[PDB]
Design an enzyme around this catalytic site. Structure first.
Site, PDB file in Angstrom:
ATOM      1  N   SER A 113      -3.964  -2.454   1.522  1.00 27.71           N
ATOM      2  CA  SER A 113      -5.314  -1.893   1.615  1.00 27.71           C
ATOM      3  C   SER A 113      -6.107  -2.230   0.342  1.00 27.71           C
ATOM      4  O   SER A 113      -5.521  -2.446  -0.711  1.00 27.71           O
ATOM      5  CB  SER A 113      -5.222  -0.372   1.783  1.00 27.71           C
ATOM      6  OG  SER A 113      -6.497   0.239   1.703  1.00 27.71           O
ATOM      7  N   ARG A 143     -16.463   7.695  -5.766  1.00 29.47           N
ATOM      8  CA  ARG A 143     -16.480   8.684  -4.694  1.00 29.47           C
ATOM      9  C   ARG A 143     -17.513   9.813  -4.822  1.00 29.47           C
ATOM     10  O   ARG A 143     -18.203  10.124  -3.852  1.00 29.47           O
ATOM     11  CB  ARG A 143     -15.072   9.263  -4.503  1.00 29.47           C
ATOM     12  CG  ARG A 143     -13.992   8.225  -4.186  1.00 29.47           C
ATOM     13  CD  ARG A 143     -14.474   7.145  -3.212  1.00 29.47           C
ATOM     14  NE  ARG A 143     -13.371   6.388  -2.619  1.00 29.47           N
ATOM     15  CZ  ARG A 143     -13.509   5.246  -1.945  1.00 29.47           C
ATOM     16  NH1 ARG A 143     -14.709   4.706  -1.770  1.00 29.47           N
ATOM     17  NH2 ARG A 143     -12.440   4.640  -1.444  1.00 29.47           N
ATOM     18  N   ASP A 188      -8.983  10.265  -2.218  1.00 29.41           N
ATOM     19  CA  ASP A 188     -10.399  10.202  -1.849  1.00 29.41           C
ATOM     20  C   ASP A 188     -10.925  11.403  -1.066  1.00 29.41           C
ATOM     21  O   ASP A 188     -12.072  11.800  -1.244  1.00 29.41           O
ATOM     22  CB  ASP A 188     -10.705   8.909  -1.089  1.00 29.41           C
ATOM     23  CG  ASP A 188     -10.560   7.666  -1.963  1.00 29.41           C
ATOM     24  OD1 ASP A 188     -10.950   7.707  -3.147  1.00 29.41           O
ATOM     25  OD2 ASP A 188     -10.066   6.636  -1.463  1.00 29.41           O
ATOM     26  N   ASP A 238     -12.291   1.512  11.195  1.00 25.59           N
ATOM     27  CA  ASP A 238     -12.038   2.948  11.196  1.00 25.59           C
ATOM     28  C   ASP A 238     -13.286   3.834  11.143  1.00 25.59           C
ATOM     29  O   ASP A 238     -13.388   4.770  11.932  1.00 25.59           O
ATOM     30  CB  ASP A 238     -11.061   3.317  10.074  1.00 25.59           C
ATOM     31  CG  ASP A 238      -9.648   2.783  10.323  1.00 25.59           C
ATOM     32  OD1 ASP A 238      -9.381   2.275  11.434  1.00 25.59           O
ATOM     33  OD2 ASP A 238      -8.800   2.878   9.410  1.00 25.59           O
TER      34      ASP A 238
HETATM   35  N1  LIG Z   1     -19.744   1.901   0.704  1.00 26.82           N
HETATM   36  C1  LIG Z   1     -19.488   3.043   1.311  1.00 26.82           C
HETATM   37  N2  LIG Z   1     -20.535   3.768   1.862  1.00 26.82           N
HETATM   38  C2  LIG Z   1     -20.304   4.942   2.488  1.00 26.82           C
HETATM   39  N3  LIG Z   1     -19.100   5.536   2.652  1.00 26.82           N
HETATM   40  C3  LIG Z   1     -18.040   4.774   2.078  1.00 26.82           C
HETATM   41  C4  LIG Z   1     -18.140   3.571   1.420  1.00 26.82           C
HETATM   42  N4  LIG Z   1     -16.898   3.108   0.988  1.00 26.82           N
HETATM   43  C5  LIG Z   1     -16.086   4.046   1.395  1.00 26.82           C
HETATM   44  N5  LIG Z   1     -16.722   5.101   2.072  1.00 26.82           N
HETATM   45  C6  LIG Z   1     -16.166   6.341   2.672  1.00 26.82           C
HETATM   46  O1  LIG Z   1     -14.809   6.562   2.107  1.00 26.82           O
HETATM   47  C7  LIG Z   1     -13.969   6.701   3.264  1.00 26.82           C
HETATM   48  C8  LIG Z   1     -12.974   5.696   3.157  1.00 26.82           C
HETATM   49  O2  LIG Z   1     -12.021   5.042   2.800  1.00 26.82           O
HETATM   50  P1  LIG Z   1     -11.368   3.824   2.513  1.00 26.82           P
HETATM   51  O3  LIG Z   1     -12.299   3.457   1.458  1.00 26.82           O
HETATM   52  O4  LIG Z   1     -10.036   4.308   2.204  1.00 26.82           O
HETATM   53  O5  LIG Z   1     -11.794   3.416   4.013  1.00 26.82           O
HETATM   54  P2  LIG Z   1     -11.576   2.039   4.930  1.00 26.82           P
HETATM   55  O6  LIG Z   1     -10.326   2.578   5.467  1.00 26.82           O
HETATM   56  O7  LIG Z   1     -11.557   1.244   3.725  1.00 26.82           O
HETATM   57  O8  LIG Z   1     -12.860   1.820   5.871  1.00 26.82           O
HETATM   58  P3  LIG Z   1     -13.138   2.044   7.452  1.00 26.82           P
HETATM   59  O9  LIG Z   1     -12.845   3.506   7.596  1.00 26.82           O
HETATM   60  O10 LIG Z   1     -14.511   1.627   7.874  1.00 26.82           O
HETATM   61  O11 LIG Z   1     -12.122   1.189   8.151  1.00 26.82           O
HETATM   62  C9  LIG Z   1     -14.491   5.996   4.413  1.00 26.82           C
HETATM   63  O12 LIG Z   1     -13.881   6.234   5.659  1.00 26.82           O
HETATM   64  C10 LIG Z   1     -15.964   6.295   4.247  1.00 26.82           C
HETATM   65  O13 LIG Z   1     -16.217   7.514   4.894  1.00 26.82           O
HETATM   66  N1  LIG Z   2      -7.126   0.653  -1.326  1.00 27.36           N
HETATM   67  C1  LIG Z   2      -7.421   1.906  -1.506  1.00 27.36           C
HETATM   68  O1  LIG Z   2      -7.679   2.618  -0.533  1.00 27.36           O
HETATM   69  N2  LIG Z   2      -7.437   2.410  -2.712  1.00 27.36           N
HETATM   70  C2  LIG Z   2      -8.490   3.398  -3.102  1.00 27.36           C
HETATM   71  C3  LIG Z   2      -8.242   3.820  -4.527  1.00 27.36           C
HETATM   72  C4  LIG Z   2      -6.970   4.614  -4.587  1.00 27.36           C
HETATM   73  C5  LIG Z   2      -6.544   4.841  -6.050  1.00 27.36           C
HETATM   74  N3  LIG Z   2      -5.061   4.973  -6.101  1.00 27.36           N
HETATM   75  C6  LIG Z   2      -7.177   6.140  -6.592  1.00 27.36           C
HETATM   76  O2  LIG Z   2      -6.568   7.174  -6.417  1.00 27.36           O
HETATM   77  O3  LIG Z   2      -8.266   6.073  -7.160  1.00 27.36           O
HETATM   78  N1  LIG Z   3      -8.444   5.513   0.454  1.00 31.32           N
HETATM   79  C1  LIG Z   3      -7.028   5.895   0.752  1.00 31.32           C
HETATM   80  C2  LIG Z   3      -6.338   6.212  -0.593  1.00 31.32           C
HETATM   81  C3  LIG Z   3      -6.793   7.506  -1.298  1.00 31.32           C
HETATM   82  O1  LIG Z   3      -7.777   8.142  -0.860  1.00 31.32           O
HETATM   83  O2  LIG Z   3      -6.147   7.881  -2.305  1.00 31.32           O
HETATM   84  C4  LIG Z   3      -6.937   7.073   1.736  1.00 31.32           C
HETATM   85  O3  LIG Z   3      -7.977   7.404   2.339  1.00 31.32           O
HETATM   86  O4  LIG Z   3      -5.841   7.658   1.862  1.00 31.32           O
END
Ligand SMILES: Nc1ncnc2c1ncn2[C@@H]1O[C@H](COP(=O)(O)OP(=O)(O)OP(=O)(O)O)[C@@H](O)[C@H]1O
Ligand SMILES: NC(=O)NCCC[C@H](N)C(=O)O
Ligand SMILES: N[C@@H](CC(=O)O)C(=O)O
Ligand SMILES: Nc1ncnc2c1ncn2[C@@H]1O[C@H](COP(=O)(O)OP(=O)(O)OP(=O)(O)O)[C@@H](O)[C@H]1O
Ligand SMILES: Nc1ncnc2c1ncn2[C@@H]1O[C@H](COP(=O)(O)OP(=O)(O)OP(=O)(O)O)[C@@H](O)[C@H]1O
Ligand SMILES: Nc1ncnc2c1ncn2[C@@H]1O[C@H](COP(=O)(O)OP(=O)(O)OP(=O)(O)O)[C@@H](O)[C@H]1O
Ligand SMILES: NC(=O)NCCC[C@H](N)C(=O)O
Ligand SMILES: NC(=O)NCCC[C@H](N)C(=O)O
Ligand SMILES: NC(=O)NCCC[C@H](N)C(=O)O
Ligand SMILES: N[C@@H](CC(=O)O)C(=O)O
Ligand SMILES: N[C@@H](CC(=O)O)C(=O)O
Ligand SMILES: N[C@@H](CC(=O)O)C(=O)O
Lengths: 386, 386, 386, 386
Positions: free
Chosen positions: B168, B92, B121, B12
């Protein structure tokens, strides 16, 4: 003169029965309550008569205990200082209540208990007694006699023909408390074998056990599909949680009278109920309601701990908690394994959960507006800082 | 136009990198943070360049994470809705902080992230960004693009040379979160083998392991006598606690955007630290301070959860928690066994515990006056009710 | 044996001075503090040597009173039960602090005060004394002597050769308290001409008077452009406010010892400060910070009222309040007219107010998204009730 | 399509009525509520049908407003940011309620209001609507139309033949709000002669006037011995308080949508009721119950302010507040004079005040025991600090 004594049947309260007769030249009416200590209360009622009681009363108060004290407290999600589920705390008001009533029926001007002058129990008994009958007279021998030590008390008992059989205990349907003696060194782990209500986790079953608890308008009404009365339900959960060593806590707490005390508690059934309730609440309670409730729980907990049960502040908070708890209707499914309780499922007839809103109506574009408005004051603050 | 993208390296954010370049006719600076996800950030950095970033930055932020975000939060005893230790929540703000710094250093007018429009997030990232740099432009593709479904997303990626591959996940030094997919059914237990950071209790050692954690002025500074930096200390406790399978929670939580969500979390080290801290506080904190502190913890927890980290309310409360925490100095002794974390001992240089006050200066009779005064208003109430 | 007595110079503390000498046969060091009672403390210090003191000390504590007690308390927006500005409450700790200090300087093992056994002052002096020097001995004649009436005290006074003369009063730079006697009937308005510090509103100027108070980092630093020290500033505002009859309160309060008491207070300068502070806070404090601060104010107030000034909970709360107060920098403009105080304007170097945000900071659709998101849980709730 | 419009009758809302007929080409149902704005809603009603309404409804809601909205709120002691008595806040929910009922009755699909996108009113109308009917469609013209400037709206007005003319005003039985225009400058005193509901203090009666208000279980039921319905009672107190210039507040408040706003309010009757209630509470409420209630009042206040009337959080708190208020029965006697309200007396058939507890169940030695026990933890602390 007549004095109604809260008689537990032990050495100290037996010594107290004698001491009260002589010191007050009074007729002592002994009252022993069965609240789940796991003892034949009738035996204490007979010992009281042998010890000199002019009358001995024993009552089965297990149902009233769970229904009118334990359940109302649990609805509040009451936890004292992070762990204490208040097992002894909610039981004292009940006993004090009957003491005053019995005193009223027997034409007794005073009541007595054997709680020491350095604990919380003395406060619970008396605040209750005074709140229910303002001009009742209370006698706490531990604060009136002059025994210089255990030896001297053993001699007094022997001299009176009272049988004189590393820590103190208080047990009832909700938990078993342990403190004093060897437990006084907070750096020292409790001795092996001390626990009685729960099985040592190291000896618990090798297979986890699932249990389901149903709640109706705030109170648990069934276990594994079997409807059970308040007292029967707590008991069943004690059996199930007990076999797996669930509900053990070790803490240094703050007593109402000012000093810290090291206490160990086992609350198998109540521990399962704590997590079962929160599990059902997670589907049935509104977010803001939940958050407000949790910020008030601690206050309620100290009220119970301190002894303010029959107090307007506690009754007032109770109105809030009961209102909130009325929505707690559903089923919690838990997994028990070697000392631990795990929530693994929950369901409710009126659950507020909608897979609709998490799975990929709702419009993501709305979130931007939400974030923009929520951020306004933060951006203004930043611009001002520059 | 320059856009700084929070790039995790997955499918993504890679799709997003390409999407941003063309949609905004801008160059993208990718930023990958190593916060303990258990992956090679240099590989994400290199993949970002291959995907088209004009610059890719990767930083080891493990120490800053634990030192500047995790520890401060833990001092407050932050727990969201009874069980969530906020593993993802506190990470975050850290990431967004760097995104904004990099944007300023690179002369980029905007930053982007791939959090969806229905989660928490997005709020954490944006509230952080706007708080630190109010004139910053934020781009959240999930709330802007026209992709209709996952299939079109794979096609877009495959078409752009981006490689393409139950629930996820989000992992970092504090925990691993699992939600979505099969977990969306609150009545279904999570699938076998789902947990990664912790060993199933069924497989954990049959021998309990004792562990000591030293606290100095609110923060854990050593484990079993060995001094460890913040990140190394959390790591150590995740290893010890992980082997015993401690720190697993299963809850249906309330998201800030309004809907309930079923989340599963494993926080081995954090869970040990939670109880260790309270163990030390039980000797080093005054009763009244503790009770007040505990009533404010939930509020602080929701602030962290909602994303108000770099916000005045949070920093104000932090002043309170930090004041209180400064007294938390001592050692906690815990017993770890098949999923449980048991406190078995605690000691402190300036412990407020006095065995002379519980053992059998203090005067029992003082207690009578205490009770009488405490009972006055209750007695008046009773008399008035006649 | 030496005994340091908080001597106010009146009939009772004089009687008390004699009583202590006879009862304990110890040297009595009289201590008289000038905290703005509007009395020549040197007269009291001489009457003390006259009455029998082996040493009489008199100190001007006006500046310390306002700077280290009144100001810190005001930063917290402390208000007991809706109206009491705690004028007497914050004064006692200061006094007790000196009593203990002197006793340590004079090598006196005990201190004494003439607060009665029915009030709050006794608790304030003693909790302060014990908190500062744990093994100090305290003597409270009102709780130890045998006088059974006023007549007996006066007689005793003449018998010993002490100058002898509808309500009790306590005055200092912050206010004048009136309670007892005629005031004991909560349905009876206080007598005409009772107030001393403020001019009867019906005799106050016909033209309103404007006054400006400058605040710097939480404390008032100037009045109408004139920089004044803490005591001089409170004094100046007492003059301006008294002239207009501002700050009169009449309430039935709950004493820490259990019963309700009818109290009447006049706090001219403090009432102006209360409102001036909030006026400046309205431009300098963030919304959420304010809301949280306001919900804690009441607690801090009861702590001050009960006597827990040198207590860990109060000092912990103080850290939060001081942190928030640090932003309170600016000017409040108030209008005074016959007993009332009206805020009519306020400004601040770092005002968070922005006219462009209200004039006819976000797009219109932003508010719609904010609303939609805020309404989500309510709509789900409604739908489930279906 | 049918659209139910909350139609006030002013310029802005008449324009909205046209805009809705024109833009949507819908059949507009006008709704004017009489809540004490001091206007013949029948005229507004006729000006609606005139302006183009396919129907116009006017309802006298004064009694419902005070009985079902103002009283419950006052019962909670609700005060926003120290001064705002929520005059406009509790009114909006009432209006949106009928708006939604009328739309259901008239089979309309949408409802509309004329609150702007910059204020709190839009939130109050919409949260109320969504909470009552989750499927309701809402239209907010200020957010949807394209007029830029007052000039344009006038043009568009004069174009359709609609009557055309310093600050904005909102009035009802509880108060009159003034904000915007010349009021936008926080340092600028309000313009002389702006106030309408309250006589100017400087022109208030030379003689003070006494007034008594009787409360029965939380609500005022009579004035000067005369029983009056909720609305008639608020009306009477507005008249009495109004002649004396009582209830003026001038503050810079924090709007829910993020920005600070300078508002001026006059709440004569309500201000008398606020002090009368607390006066009766001073005799009828228990100490600890009162202290708890006051710490919750501010939260309930922001709930009302933000628009969460028909929300579970508010209803839960209402259960607590209603429980507490049930004890509030008695009479308050206040003295009105030159813009101030002085409580001079209070009585209750079940007062908790006992003169015998204060005049010279309460014993001397008791206070000492109370103090010692209260001091223990402080003594231990000092000792540990060596
Ligand atoms: N280690 C990291 N470094 C930088 N940005 C991050 C990191 N981990 C998460 N993020 C940011 O938080 C947002 C993401 O969410 P989540 O953690 O829900 O994403 P994913 O869906 O896990 O990853 P991707 O978007 O690559 O498939 C990301 O799209 C990215 O912009
Ligand atoms: N797998 C995920 O994307 N989870 C990210 C953390 C979500 C959690 N419920 C939170 O709000 O902190
Ligand atoms: N990481 C997931 C969950 C969250 O942010 O609460 C999303 O981007 O929706
Ligand atoms: N089942 C009971 N029925 C009536 N009164 C009881 C009961 N259990 C406890 N009490 C009352 O509570 C007071 C007691 O405390 P505790 O439970 O600490 O007492 P003990 O059993 O008397 O002493 P210990 O076990 O510490 O030697 C008792 O002295 C007694 O007056
Ligand atoms: N200015 C002061 N300096 C020192 N101690 C003071 C002062 N004002 C009050 N106190 C202390 O507070 C205690 C008194 O109470 P209160 O103010 O209730 O006394 P009084 O009974 O009004 O006066 P007095 O007994 O001197 O005639 C006093 O007995 C004294 O110990
Ligand atoms: N008496 C009433 N009956 C029905 N709806 C009303 C009434 N008073 C106000 N409203 C509703 O509340 C919304 C209005 O706000 P306000 O009361 O601030 O509006 P206005 O009267 O429209 O504007 P202005 O500031 O120019 O007077 C209105 O647009 C209308 O929809
Ligand atoms: N063994 C005991 O006497 N314990 C009684 C319970 C004491 C516990 N700390 C409580 O305060 O409830
Ligand atoms: N006259 C007095 O002795 N009053 C002193 C102030 C008492 C006030 N009710 C207080 O508790 O602070
Ligand atoms: N004149 C107005 O439009 N005022 C409406 C009430 C605004 C007030 N500040 C409130 O939020 O309730
Ligand atoms: N039951 C014990 C402990 C307590 O009351 O807290 C006692 O009587 O002292
Ligand atoms: N000063 C008075 C009142 C009080 O202390 O509250 C007394 O000594 O009793
Ligand atoms: N009534 C005004 C103010 C507000 O709603 O707060 C508006 O419609 O904007």
């Amino acid at each position: 003169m007549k004095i109604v004594l809260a008689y537990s049947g032990g050495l100290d309260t037996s010594i107290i029965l004698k001491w009260l007769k002589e010191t007050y030249r009074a007729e002592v009416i002994a009252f022993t309550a069965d609240i789940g200590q796991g003892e034949e209360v009738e035996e204490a009622r007979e010992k009281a008569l042998r010890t000199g009681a002019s009358k001995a009363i024993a009552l089965d108060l297990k149902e009233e205990f769970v229904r009118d004290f334990v359940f109302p407290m649990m609805r509040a999600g009451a936890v004292y200082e992070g762990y204490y589920l208040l097992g002894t705390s909610i039981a004292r008001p009940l006993i004090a209540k009957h003491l005053v009533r019995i005193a009223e029926e027997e034409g007794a001007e005073a009541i007595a208990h054997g709680a020491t002058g350095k604990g919380n129990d003395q406060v619970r008994f008396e605040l209750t007694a005074y709140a229910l009958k303002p001009d009742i007279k209370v006698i706490a021998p531990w604060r009136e006699w002059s025994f210089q030590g255990r030896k001297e008390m053993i001699a007094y008992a022997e001299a009176h023909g009272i049988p004189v059989p590393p820590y103190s205990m208080d047990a009832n349907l909700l938990h078993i408390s342990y403190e004093g003696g060897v437990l006084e060194d907070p750096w020292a782990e409790p001795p092996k074998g001390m626990f009685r209500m729960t099985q040592d986790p190291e000896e618990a079953p090798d297979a986890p056990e699932y249990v389901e608890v149903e709640f109706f308008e705030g109170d648990p009404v069934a276990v594994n599909g079997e409807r059970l009365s308040p007292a029967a339900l707590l008991q069943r959960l004690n059996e199930i949680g007990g076999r797996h060593g669930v509900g053990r806590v070790d803490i240094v707490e703050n007593r109402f009278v000012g000093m810290k005390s090291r206490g160990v508690y086992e609350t198998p059934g109540g521990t399962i109920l704590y997590h079962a309730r929160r599990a059902v609440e997670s589907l049935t309670l509104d977010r803001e309601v939940l958050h407000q409730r949790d910020m008030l729980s601690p206050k309620y907990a100290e009220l119970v701990y301190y002894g303010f049960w029959y107090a307007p502040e506690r009754e007032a908070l109770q109105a809030y908690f009961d209102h909130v708890a009325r929505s707690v209707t559903g089923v919690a499914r838990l997994k028990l394994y070697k000392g631990n309780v795990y929530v693994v499922g929950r369901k409710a007839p009126k659950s507020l959960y909608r897979q609709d809103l998490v799975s990929f109506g709702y419009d993501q574009k709305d979130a931007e507006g939400f974030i923009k408005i929520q951020a306004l004051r933060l951006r203004v603050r930043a611009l001002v800082e520059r």
